[PDB]
Amino acid sequence: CPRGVYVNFYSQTECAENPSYPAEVARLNVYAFDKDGILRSANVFEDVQLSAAKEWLIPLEKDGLYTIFAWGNIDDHYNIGEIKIGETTKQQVLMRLKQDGKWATNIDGTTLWYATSPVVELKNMEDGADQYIHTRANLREYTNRVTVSVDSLPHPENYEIKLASSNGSYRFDGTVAKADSTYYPGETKVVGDSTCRAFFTTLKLESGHENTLSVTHKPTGREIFRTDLVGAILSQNINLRCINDFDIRLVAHHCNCPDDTYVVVQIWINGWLIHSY
């Protein structure tokens, strides 16, 4: 007698009043872990079109409590670790962003999604126990698009914006695995006479590890600015658990000190003045 959980995938961010069903999610990796956090089921679905009334069957066999972990748009940008049924556990590393040294592969134009379903339960069918069961899971986007401008700066082509974060590795549950920091590829436009703009696509932005935004004078290598992006943020208005796009302005000014060097004296994020210096 065959058994399983039907799962419906939605996206409702917490600031959203109605659930969404993002077209951005094109494929799925859905795992089932049991009472012990051991992998019991591993499934892959291509051609995903999330919908209000669409479901996906997650095969199970033995009665019990299960939680489902779901990943959207797992790509060949990622090094996938061991996945072994009856062995692999919830907190092992599923995934590492592919890197070249400490530089991330460029993931602009990609979305990455995670959901945890509630705990569900296959009950003894020999007694009063349904069919298959059903549940829903909320896909939260883990990718973040971060635009940064450094303003009022002579020779803006001589400066480089960098974004480091220890956020390229994830456990089976959606949590960030500990790792060395990862630099993300900052594609650049000198936009103004005194302005330089960089665009980063990074993964999850949360406290608990390095999330360093920095500005460096390339010819000398002199880092003129460094701050923890998440820290700056959580100093809102700017709620990381509902948002995924970050327009950041860094206002530079000559230091007036005997270093004849520039410094950052204002950091704006999504239109809020976060810190003056």
Residue numbers in the entry: 40 to 274, 279 to 320
Sentences from the paper on this structure:
The resulting mature protein thereby has an empty position in the first β-sheet that a β-strand donated from another fimbrial protein presumably fills in order to polymerize the individual proteins into a polymeric fimbria.
The full mature form, ranging from residues 29–324 was expressed, purified and crystallized. The first is formed between Cys54 and Cys285 and links the long β1β2-loop of the N-domain with a loop from the C-domain at the domain interface. In Mfa2 the equivalent residues are Val44, Val46 and Phe48. In the regulatory protein Mfa2, the C-terminus forms a final β-strand that following a β-hairpin runs antiparallel to the preceding strand. Whereas the Trps in Mfa1 and Mfa3 are firmly anchored in similar pockets, the equivalent Trp of Mfa2 (W315) is solvent exposed, due to the bend between the two last β-strands.
